[PDB]
């Protein structure tokens, strides 16, 4: 279906009919169904497995396009799922645009600690500014 939808969405939902009958698969179609209608479905689907971090992460982006909301999702998300640095990178890259952000980077760094991808976050966003 990924190769099929690579070059029709009418089949996608049709294939998604039998797909729900059985955060790997759900996120796939959710990512595909992205073309605010998702916010409903995503919320209903992400309330199933609450992985939860990717669920958190995906909805935020859709919220990012929709929305305040984005920051709220991030803050709740990070505490629940603190571990992936992808989240705190995004949250800090939010606050940054409107400095608070370094604290957000740094407050989470120590909770991890000493994985790699957080230091690069700090670096990578210390250059930009």
């Amino acid at each position: 279906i990924k190769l099929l939808g690579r070059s029709r969405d009418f089949f996608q939902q049709t294939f998604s009919s039998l797909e729900d009958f059985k955060s790997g698969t759900e996120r796939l179609y959710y990512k595909y169904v992205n073309f605010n209608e998702e916010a409903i479905k995503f919320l209903n689907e992400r309330c199933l497995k609450s992985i939860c971090h990717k669920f958190f992460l995906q909805l935020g982006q859709i919220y990012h396009s929709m929305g305040e909301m984005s920051r709220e999702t991030y803050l709740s998300g990070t505490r629940l799922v603190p571990n992936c640095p992808l989240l705190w990178v995004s949250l800090s890259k939010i606050d940054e645009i409107d400095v608070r952000a370094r604290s957000i980077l740094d407050r989470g760094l120590l909770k991890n600690p000493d994985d790699v991808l957080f230091y690069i976050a700090k670096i990578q966003m210390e250059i930009r500014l």
Binding site: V99, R100, A101, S103, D106, R107
Partner: protein
């Protein structure tokens, strides 16, 4: 060990300190005493608990930058 003499002018200051110091100390002690009388332990023992909870909460607000050498002193104004 010696007693060193000299500097009468400074000597003047010590007097000033004594006048200032003595009064201040007297006021301070009196104030401390006044606190003692009320007791009513319950209020106080609540207060400490509240303070500790407040301390527990605290977090970063921002960082910031200054230079490229470590920062040796920071101070806040009286306001």
């Amino acid at each position: 060990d010696f007693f060193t003499p000299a500097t009468s002018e400074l000597i003047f200051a010590r007097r000033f300190l004594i006048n200032y110091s003595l009064e201040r100390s007297r006021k301070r002690l009196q104030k401390e005493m006044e606190r003692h009388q009320k007791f009513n332990t319950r209020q106080e023992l609540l207060s400490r608990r509240t303070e500790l909870q407040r301390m527990a909460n605290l977090e970063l607000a921002g960082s910031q930058l200054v230079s490229t050498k470590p920062i040796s002193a920071v101070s806040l104004s009286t306001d």
